[PDB]
């Protein structure tokens, strides 16, 4: 049978699925460790890898496939149910096996996906710094309609201290930090002016290799939420720019407290997608 990981209502995305709205025809690019192509529940159907060694539809880490299952586990008798599970799935493989990856492997991933006519990027990996060749990498891809959506950071708070990491905290990528079943901020969650929105991201249970569904925790579980949800308000708008998307997904979510520890709040996607 099919579990329903807590996630997907508590974003309402089940809501959405129901009015028969479920991400068919958006391309989704999820840059990370790659994907288990292979898994029951998941369907990728292109990508490309960065990495030296590793061809895109296989994943010797986990990171990239567990990802992919929350973006769009396979709606079945089986498994899990992603966000968003009609869209067409690429796996861009900018992270070593590791869960590490270089400047340029990532900024190639993301030339590769705006080249490639991505509508959703996927970036559930940061780091303290970023670089110049990042900055105009995700500009670009923004400026070219893609929605751009990259994890927060598990770095806490600490004070007044910014912990939002980067791509993340490049103003044209959504900063998205995590909440857990109760929708309260998990502790690992960054902070500060960049965060933008909430998701699920302690306790997301998902595809994992091999062929199985674990349970992970950090807010690059809670950023496939989102890109999910991009996808879905996609698929039932299908002309609105990148930015109308990212709108509605930040003037609709929950009011949860403070903006510097939860953004504008939880993502709503059946109030997003109205
Ligand atoms: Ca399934
Ligand atoms: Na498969
Ligand atoms: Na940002």
Known sequence: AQT????????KAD???????????????????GIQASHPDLNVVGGASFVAGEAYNTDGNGHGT???????ALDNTTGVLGVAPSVSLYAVKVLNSSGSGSYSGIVSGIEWATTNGMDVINMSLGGASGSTAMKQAV???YARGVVVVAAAGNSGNSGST?????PAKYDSVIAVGAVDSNSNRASFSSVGAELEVMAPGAGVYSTYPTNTYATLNGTSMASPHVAGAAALILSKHPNLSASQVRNRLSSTATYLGSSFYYGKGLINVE???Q
């Open 66 to 72: 567990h990802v992919a299952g929350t973006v769009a």
């Open 4 to 11: 329903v990981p807590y996630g997907i209502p508590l974003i």
């Open 271 to 273: 109030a997003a997608a």
């Open 15 to 33: 809501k959405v699925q129901a009015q028969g709205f479920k991400g068919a025809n958006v391309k989704v690019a999820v840059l990370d460790t």
């Open 139 to 141: 500009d670009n891809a």
């Open 162 to 166: 910014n912990t939002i990491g980067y």
